[PDB]
Amino acid sequence: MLCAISGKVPRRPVLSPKSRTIFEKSLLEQYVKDTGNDPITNEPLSIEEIVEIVPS
Amino acid sequence: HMLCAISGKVPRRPVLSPKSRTIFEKSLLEQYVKDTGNDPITNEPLSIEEIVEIVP
């Protein structure tokens, strides 16, 4: 449950439904805004498709 | 410190419900869904196949 990029427990955890992987929200959104793709699989991914995770 | 919404413990095999956008232990959410047909937080219909298994 670490961010796939930062390697840390996310402050704001989200999941990409394409890679089924956890990210820090802003780090995933940076990739999505810049490329329109999931950074692990290169599949298309929109901001609206990201699943924000409700904290415990 | 993402904990299962049922056990309150760090899941060994975390999964996400797309309805509640909430993390659970895989076995616990699967059992809840087998019993009720629903997401435990929102009470909406949920199938086992909709559960997102998170990639380690």
From Swiss-Prot, chain B:
Protein location: Nucleus
Ranges for domain U-box: 2-56
Additional remarks: Present with 11700 molecules/cell in log phase SD medium. The tetramer is an elongated particle consisting of four globular WD40 domains held together by a central stalk.
Role summary: Probable ubiquitin-protein ligase involved in pre-mRNA splicing. Acts as a central component of the NTC complex (or PRP19-associated complex) that associates to the spliceosome to mediate conformational rearrangement or to stabilize the structure of the spliceosome after U4 snRNA dissociation, which leads to spliceosome maturation. It is also probably involved in DNA repair.
Annotated family: Belongs to the WD repeat PRP19 family.
Complex and partners: Homotetramer. Component of the NTC complex (or PRP19-associated complex), composed of at least CEF1, CLF1, ISY1, NTC20, SNT309, SYF1, SYF2, and PRP19.
Name of the protein in its database record: Pre-mRNA-processing factor 19
Residues of the full protein shown: 1 to 55 of 503
